[PDB]
């Protein structure tokens, strides 16, 4: 009806509708620790809300209510519960609490309640059908927005929405090819898909991301794909992939190419390779330029992963 | 070596000019922000050196602590947005306190106890504020917080046996847990859960039932633990599921080496700092989430037998995160923040100081090392990196509920 | 403090 910032709002206090009921003030206490102090809206706002909760009425005031205390604190989960107990009880549209939430969500995307409560009627409705479409919008602002990627996550899972999920991680990943939630979504498609088992679905995914990695070749997100992949089964299971990245060492010495060829020979050291004390020696030597030179950041780490490798494969 | 009036810094070396950001000629917005976080930190570093002159970097405690103390009793209206979370703000505050080593009066330790003994619902459990429904977040603050003031009085507002059937009130058949009653369900909730309930002594061998295996369905390809399967690795939740696998002792259940390679990779190259997650930006914040892993698989790796673990550092640039934190998440006003351009909040105060604490102190079986960069003056209370409380604090309270018997359970 | 713009909420 009205909003909080319209120029016809009145506080609940003042409102004839609301005379019959007592506002319930907030008890912090004689000495009170962080106290805020609420803005003279807000504080009315909460007084009312505190009574309804505690007389549990099941009012269209009520749910009228829950909306301005929504809009001065989106994060208060115990009205978003409230709302959603209201919502089941006064056996309210739905449809038109989804186009309340997608407003909602527009405005504060990066809040937990709001989410939540989406799915929640997603769940009610058992219809996903604007849910792609919605969390696409919420993307094209912040492509790499955590709970946005989560409800897409769960919505494709639980409905099985996956056709066309692969054509979308491509789109993205040809805005932004450093977007490391799209990656980690290309994962999420394919090993619910068609899995990672079939040669050629890998070969397909080997190829496409040495090639962006050729195109991008510090984009950490690219070369941390490549070996989510091959990790499993073992980055020394894959000879030809060694000797591509030893090529393309002298022209792109990147720290991410160097550990990738650590990672590479410790698992062929795993694995009884063959030439075991040369392998060594080109992996502590690399672990060495890695901590003094081209990845310092993590010279700890690469000391001790030249400690370890000497403790499992000296002889 | 060179005079006690100057200290050379790993991020003033002519060759840190070379860690700087290479776009490959390639633009994308996720380059675009970074190269603008780098020449914005480029110029604070700068500012610290004056030719071979660089003097001892310093933390101002008695700015944060004068803004510490005000926020503990008053807030203004900035913080109407977590009126959902003031347990946080004490636990926040106090933490930040108690890493400073400055006192907390008897009165206002009894003020904090009063207020959360409101916060505290007849169902079990802590709600954001007097009378709101409790949760998961605001429990874990509010437990920590009466921790951190370690009194009789403190631990005894805790009502044990209606905690525990909240948290029964909250467990999936999956392992996972609520947040709360009709709430949304991720990592965060595991390690809330697993930390009240090991400190306040309420562990049934079923509570935790299939909790360690959906922590692990939670690691992905890139060996950070994201919030539910299938999600993006990141640090808050990493630090979670990591540290809620160590209280439950089934860290095992987890790929050490992938997550140990994909935090180290957090640490960036030219601030220092830490990030959330691959290729997003610098935030001070995750000085605790990020860095506060390497002490925990330290020690998962250590209780493994690892003959190559460090006995004197821990995984991460210790110097380098130090150096981040001081130069370039201090408020002149007192106050921490993410990162320069960013307004302090007690949030952010908070886990500043707390990953200051875990850089400046190495510490495992009878091994102790310390590395306080700058003045003397900031070295730090150690802080223990499961539940982020004093060390001292953890035992005091684990040795005093562990004399109470599990709520109605033998 | 501008808590209700960082992207940083835990709850
Ligand atoms: C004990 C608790 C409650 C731990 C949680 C700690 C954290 C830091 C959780 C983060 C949750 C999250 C990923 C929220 C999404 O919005 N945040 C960002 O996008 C921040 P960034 O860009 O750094 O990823
Ligand atoms: O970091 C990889 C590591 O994580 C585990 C879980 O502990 O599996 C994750 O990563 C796999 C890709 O490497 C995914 O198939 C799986 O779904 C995800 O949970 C370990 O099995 C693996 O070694
Ligand atoms: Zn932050």
């Known amino acids: 009806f009205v909003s909080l910032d319209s120029p016809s709002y ?8 609301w005379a019959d009921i007592d506002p319930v003030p907030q008890n912090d206490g004689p000495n009170p620790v962080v106290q805020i102090i609420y803005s003279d809206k807000f504080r009315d706002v909460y007084d009312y809300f505190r009574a309804v909760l505690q007389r549990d009425e099941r009012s269209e005031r009520a749910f009228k209510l829950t909306r301005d205390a929504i809009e001065l604190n989106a994060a208060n989960y115990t009205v978003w519960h409230f709302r959603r107990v209201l919502l089941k009880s006064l056996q309210k549209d739905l449809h038109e609490e989804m186009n309340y939430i997608t407003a ?5 995307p990066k809040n937990y309640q709001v989410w939540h409560h989406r799915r929640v009627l997603v769940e009610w409705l ?7 479409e919605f969390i696409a919008d919420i993307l094209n602002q912040d492509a790499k927005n955590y ?3 989560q409800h897409r996550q769960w919505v494709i899972q639980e409905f099985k929405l996956w056709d066309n999920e692969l054509q979308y991680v491509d789109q993205l990943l040809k805005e932004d090819v450093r977007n490391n939630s799209v990656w980690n979504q290309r994962y999420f498609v394919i090993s619910n898909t068609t899995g990672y088992n079939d040669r ?12 962006m990695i050729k195109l991008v070749p510090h984009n950490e997100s690219a070369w941390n794909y490549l070996k989510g992949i091959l990790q499993d089964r073992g980055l020394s299971k894959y000879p030809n992939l060694l000797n591509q990245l030893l090529d393309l060492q002298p022209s792109h010495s990147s720290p991410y190419l160097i550990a990738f060829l650590v990672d590479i020979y410790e698992d062929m050291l795993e694995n009884q390779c063959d030439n075991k004390e040369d392998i060594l020696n080109k992996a502590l030597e690399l672990c060495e330029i890695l901590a003094k030179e081209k990845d310092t950041i993590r010279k700890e780490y690469w000391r001790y992963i030249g400690r370890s490798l000497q403790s499992k494969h000296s002889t | 070596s060179s005079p006690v009036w100057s200290e050379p810094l790993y991020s003033l070396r002519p060759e840190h000019a070379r860690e700087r950001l290479q776009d490959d000629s390639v633009e994308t917005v996720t380059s675009i922000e970074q190269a603008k976080v780098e020449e914005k930190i480029q110029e604070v570093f700068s500012s610290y050196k004056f030719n071979h002159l660089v003097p001892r970097l310093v933390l101002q405690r008695e700015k944060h602590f004068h803004y510490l103390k005000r926020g503990l009793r008053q807030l203004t209206d900035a913080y109407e947005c977590l009126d959902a979370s003031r347990p946080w703000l004490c636990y926040w505050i106090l933490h930040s306190l108690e890493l400073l080593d400055e006192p907390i009066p008897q009165i206002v330790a009894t003020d904090v106890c009063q207020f959360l003994e409101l916060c505290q619902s007849p169902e079990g459990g802590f709600g954001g504020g007097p ?3 409790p949760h998961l977040a605001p429990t874990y603050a509010a437990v920590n917080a009466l921790c951190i003031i370690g009194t009789e009085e403190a631990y005894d507002i805790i009502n044990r046996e209606k905690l525990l059937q909240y948290l029964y009130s909250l467990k999936q058949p999956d392992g996972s847990f609520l947040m709360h009653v009709g709430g949304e369900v991720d990592v965060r909730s595991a390690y809330c859960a697993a930390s009240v309930a090991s400190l306040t002594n309420i562990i049934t061998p079923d509570l935790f039932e299939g909790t360690a295996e959906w922590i692990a369905r939670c690691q992905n390809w890139e060996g950070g633990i994201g919030g539910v399967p299938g999600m993006e690795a990141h640090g808050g939740y990493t630090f979670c599921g990591l540290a809620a696998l160590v209280i439950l002792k089934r860290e095992r259940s987890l790929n050490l080496k992938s997550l140990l390679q994909w935090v180290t990779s957090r640490q960036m190259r030219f601030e220092g700092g830490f990030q959330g997650r691959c290729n997003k930006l610098v935030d001070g914040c995750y000085s605790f989430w990020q860095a506060g892993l390497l002490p925990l698989l330290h020690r998962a790796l250590h209780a493994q037998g690892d003959p190559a673990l460090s006995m004197s550092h821990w995984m991460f640039h210790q110097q380098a995160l130090q150096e981040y934190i001081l130069m370039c998440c201090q408020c002149p006003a007192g106050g921490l923040l993410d990162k320069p351009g960013k307004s302090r909040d007690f949030y952010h105060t908070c886990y500043c ?26 070295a730090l209370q150690p802080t223990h990196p499961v539940y982020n409380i004093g060390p001292d604090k953890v035992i005091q309270a684990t040795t005093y509920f562990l004399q109470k018997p599990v709520p109605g359970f033998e | 403090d501008d808590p209700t713009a960082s992207a940083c909420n835990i709850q």
């Open chain 1, 10 to 17: 009145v506080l609940y206090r003042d409102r004839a509708e």
């Open chain 1, 104 to 108: 909602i969500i527009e405005e504060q």
């Open chain 1, 126 to 132: 058992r219809d996903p059908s604007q849910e792609l």
């Open chain 1, 147 to 149: 709970h946005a990627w």
């Open chain 1, 200 to 211: 050629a679905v890998l070969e397909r995914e080997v190829q496409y991301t040495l090639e």
């Open chain 2, 131 to 133: 009378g709101q429904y």
């Open chain 2, 353 to 378: 100081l707390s990953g200051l604490s875990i850089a400046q102190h190495f510490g495992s079986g009878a091994m102790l090392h310390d590395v306080v960069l700058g003045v003397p003056e900031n």
